[PDB]
Amino acid sequence: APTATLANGDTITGLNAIINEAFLGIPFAEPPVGNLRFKDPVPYSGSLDGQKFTSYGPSCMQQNPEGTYEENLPKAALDLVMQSKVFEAVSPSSEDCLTINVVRPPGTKAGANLPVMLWIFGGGFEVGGTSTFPPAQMITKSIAMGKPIIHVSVNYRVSSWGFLAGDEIKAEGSANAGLKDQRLGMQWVADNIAAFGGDPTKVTIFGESAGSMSVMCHILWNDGDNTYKGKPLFRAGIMQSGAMVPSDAVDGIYGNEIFDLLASNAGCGSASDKLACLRGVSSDTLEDATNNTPGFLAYSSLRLSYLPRPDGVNITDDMYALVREGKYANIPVIIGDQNDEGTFFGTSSLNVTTDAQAREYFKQSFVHASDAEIDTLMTAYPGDITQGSPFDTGILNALTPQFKRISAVLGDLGFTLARRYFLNHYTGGTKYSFLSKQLSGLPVLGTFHSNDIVFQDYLLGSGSLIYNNAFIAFATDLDPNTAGLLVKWPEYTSSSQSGNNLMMINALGLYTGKDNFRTAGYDALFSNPPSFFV
Numbered sequence: 348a349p350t351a352t353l354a355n356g357d358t359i360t361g362l363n364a365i366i367n368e369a370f371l372g373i374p375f376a377e378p379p380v381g382n383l384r385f386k387d388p389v390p391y392s393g394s395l396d397g398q399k400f401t402s403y404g405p406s407c408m409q410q411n412p413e414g415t416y417e418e419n420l421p422k423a424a425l426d427l428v429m430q431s432k433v434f435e436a437v438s439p440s441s442e443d444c445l446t447i448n449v450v451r452p453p454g455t456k457a458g459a460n461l462p463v464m465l466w467i468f469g470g471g472f473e474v475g476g477t478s479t480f481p482p483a484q485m486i487t488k489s490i491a492m493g494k495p496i497i498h499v500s501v502n503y504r505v506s507s508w509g510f511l512a513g514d515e516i517k518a519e520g521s522a523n524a525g526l527k528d529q530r531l532g533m534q535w536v537a538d539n540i541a542a543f544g545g546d547p548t549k550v551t552i553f554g555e556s557a558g559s560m561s562v563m564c565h566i567l568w569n570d571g572d573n574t575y576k577g578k579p580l581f582r583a584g585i586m587q588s589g590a591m592v593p594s595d596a597v598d599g600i601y602g603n604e605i606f607d608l609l610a611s612n613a614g615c616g617s618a619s620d621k622l623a624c625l626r627g628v629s630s631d632t633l634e635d636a637t638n639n640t641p642g643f644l645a646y647s648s649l650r651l652s653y654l655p656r657p658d659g660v661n662i663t664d665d666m667y668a669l670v671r672e673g674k675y676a677n678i679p680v681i682i683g684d685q686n687d688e689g690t691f692f693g694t695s696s697l698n699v700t701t702d703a704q705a706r707e708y709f710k711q712s713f714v715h716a717s718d719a720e721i722d723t724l725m726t727a728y729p730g731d732i733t734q735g736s737p738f739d740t741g742i743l744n745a746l747t748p749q750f751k752r753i754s755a756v757l758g759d760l761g762f763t764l765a766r767r768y769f770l771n772h773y774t775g776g777t778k779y780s781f782l783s784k785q786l787s788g789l790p791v792l793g794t795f796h797s798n799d800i801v802f803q804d805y806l807l808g809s810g811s812l813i814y815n816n817a818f819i820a821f822a823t824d825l826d827p828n829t830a831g832l833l834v835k836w837p838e839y840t841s842s843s844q845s846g847n848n849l850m851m852i853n854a855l856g857l858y859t860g861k862d863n864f865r866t867a868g869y870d871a872l873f874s875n876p877p878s879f880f881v
């Protein structure tokens with residue numbers, strides 16, 4: 348029943364789910380297959396007239412989270428699962444995966460001009476799909492609030508398929524294919540969203556974790572120019588756990604190391620042109636070769652095998668430098684974190700039990716760090732188990748003498764303190780920040796990484812007041828305070844400002860606090876950011 352006429356005249360049919368209308372699996376680019384592998388996406392040319400879009404398309408190829416060149420049980424276990432016909436049945440994946448989804452309130456018609464929330468999923472830049480992020484909770488809530496919004500989600504290439512790097516990739520100008528897929532998705536929204544009832548000038552981009560870092564990348568894309576056909580692609584952004592990516596250039600050391608390993612794994616180690624050889628292997632071969640490179644749950648943890656890297660063209664330089672240099676789009680933003688962002692990643696190195704092994708693990712993870720810098724880090728983040736994450740849990744959660752320490756470090760560099768650095772240098776627009784402690788007391792993990800996804804798409808909780816209501820108000824009025832919350836959300840100007848500047852969330856509800864914790868780690872970590880890039 349639900350129908351829409353795209354900008355090229357094609358008329359498409361959606362699915363009436365009653366609580367909302369959906370248009371799932373719309374292709375926005377040609378299959379990045381064959382010789383199009385690793386290359387910039389190409390706008391879809393085919394006609395869609397008369398076609399129905401009532402179900403999510405396949406996700407892009409996924410990399411085993413426990414993938415690694417080594418051989419262990421976790422890897423073998425996940426592999427066994429991810430290759431089962433049952434798994435490929437419930438969660439299909441393919442290289443032909445560049446589709447987009449539009450879900451709106453029931454009865455919404457063309458010209459409605461409702462604000463648009465364009466979701467970018469996160470998954471360590473190695474796994475992920477749009478189908479596992481239900482928009483119903485957000486949509487229904489926005490309606491009950493009298494601020495109906497349209498939910499748009501875009502698939503993009505992950506892992507070796509979307510973030511392959513190295514000298515060859517750089518020379519080709521094919522860096523950051525995954526981010527480019529997202530960018531094309533945004534342009535597709537600009538040209539066609541009006542047909543679904545959305546207002547292209549009211550697009551707010553939001554994502555969590557890898558999706559959150561993606562949002563940051565879009566703010567810094569092309570040195571800040573986020574225009575398309577003379578108009579901005581988005582008027583605001585919401586970053587849920589993830590700011591700048593601490594990475595070396597695309598043709599850096601680890602970028603090349605990984606590219607060579609992958610090529611060897613695929614049997615292209617003797618090709619004079621390794622890139623063309625990789626475009627020649629079958630899907631299976633590439634999938635297998637990729638699963639033999641470190642995944643995000645493997646020992647390498649945060650030192651990701653695949654992720655956004657400055658290319659000198661679309662991301663002109665060091666990302667922390669781009670922010671200091673003011674090379675970004677000027678939009679209002681909301682950026683927050685979960686209290687214990689790093690506990691998940693800390694479970695990947697439970698073989699590290701002594702300070703000496705901890706120091707060694709850090710030296711391996713951050714190759715640019717000098718011994719002095721490492722000593723400083725280990726002083727800012729002491730062995731004292733009562734001081735690590737899960738924070739404020741005393742002697743509890745001591746899986747090892749180093750677990751809470753490694754969890755704290757990884758959590759801060761990758762997300763929590765990285766956020767403060769951005770907030771302390773960004774003058775692009777009004778800034779709002781939150782810190783969730785909604786799950787204080789949860790054994791081992793605490794208020795863990797990605798728990799907000801549950802309270803935003805699956806279950807209702809104190810945090811839903813922020814992940815839903817506040818976010819909907821922001822996308823609608825550009826001020827979270829129009830949501831009508833009992834606690835006023837203060838504006839963030841500086842981590843050094845007096846008065847509360849953080850919206851806080853506990854199990855009972857909301858309150859405000861200050862972004863002034865672990866200042867020693869902040870300095871030890873960001874005096875010279877590049878010393879800790881991967």
Ligand SMILES: *[C@H]1O[C@H](CO)[C@@H](O[C@@H]2O[C@H](CO)[C@@H](O)[C@H](O)[C@H]2NC(C)=O)[C@H](O)[C@H]1NC(C)=O
Binds near residue numbers: 646699700
């Ligand atoms: C704890 O486990 C990790 C994971 O295997 C060990 O790291 C690997 O060690 C082997 C043997 O030397 C190497 O071949 C691999 O290259 C290492 N993996 C990576 C990605 O570095 C680590 O040495 C162990 N640490 C301690 C303190 O026992």
Ligand SMILES: *[C@@H]1O[C@H](CO)[C@@H](O)[C@H](O)[C@H]1NC(C)=O
Binds near residue numbers: 527530569660661
């Ligand atoms: C990549 O950067 C170049 C440099 O100007 C630009 O021409 C091109 O449009 C950029 N690609 C995208 C997706 O914006």
Ligand SMILES: [Ca+2]
Binds near residue numbers: 514603607
């Ligand atoms: Ca090489």
Ligand SMILES: [Ca+2]
Binds near residue numbers: 672673675
């Ligand atoms: Ca500027």
